[model samples]
Target: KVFGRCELAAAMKRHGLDNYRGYSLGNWVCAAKFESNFNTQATNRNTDGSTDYGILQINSRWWCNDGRTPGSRNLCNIPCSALLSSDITASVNCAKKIVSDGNGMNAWVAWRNRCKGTDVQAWIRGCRL
Candidate 1:
């Protein structure tokens, strides 16, 4: 299911993502906006023939198994489809692992290029988190 911005923000916060791993809530929200627009089923094909999955657009090259994608590290050990669900606990947990692995939010290209150094207040503005 697709979630509204505020709803997504609240959910992320409720999931303990606010200020997670030294990254602000705004960064998380901003990355989610550019990655998948809060669509749990979102997926995108990469130039490398791999695919990104879910709201975080986690890459198949190093994360989940997509079955068809070859050489997937499946580092998260979860099916890529698991990321594409209304219940985002798996996605969030996987994302936290990604961030903790020295990549930080830069694991997300969208966050590195778009959200980095930007005023992301608009992402969570007025959201009662």
Candidate 2:
């Protein structure tokens, strides 16, 4: 259960994503799916021998170019986990920032319409935060 539905709901409210908690859970899930397949342990590798790791799949190169402990491969450097430990939920909120300026639920509504099945265009366009 990515980021505890209750916590995310509260964060959403703090970020101005919602005033009510009832429906925000679904919206958080939607955005998480679009962002990282709801996998808190998910990872992806580039053909160039670089890596992207964690629930959000944040590229190592961008966040950690110097190769520190966890060697940039670690996600601890990013503030995402502190926002929402559930990888899916954190990524969704992260992506939402790019799409909705901290208002992720709005982006979720739009994503639900565009992303249906394997189609990723909507994710690319709507969730870039």
lDDT of each candidate versus the true structure: 0.90, 0.44
Q: What are the per-residue Cα lDDT tens digits for candidate 2 across 6-114? A: 4544444565444233333345444545555555655566665565544445555544332532433433345523433542445444444444444433434334564
Q: Which stretches of candidate 1 lie over 4 Å from their true place?
A: none
Alpha-carbon RMSD of each model: 1.0, 9.3
Off by over 4 Å in 2: 1-31, 64-129
> Against the true structure, what is each candidate's TM-score?
0.95, 0.37
* lDDT value for model 1: 0.90
For candidate 1, give the lDDT of residue 114: 98
lDDT of 1 at 92: 94
TM-score of model number 2: 0.37
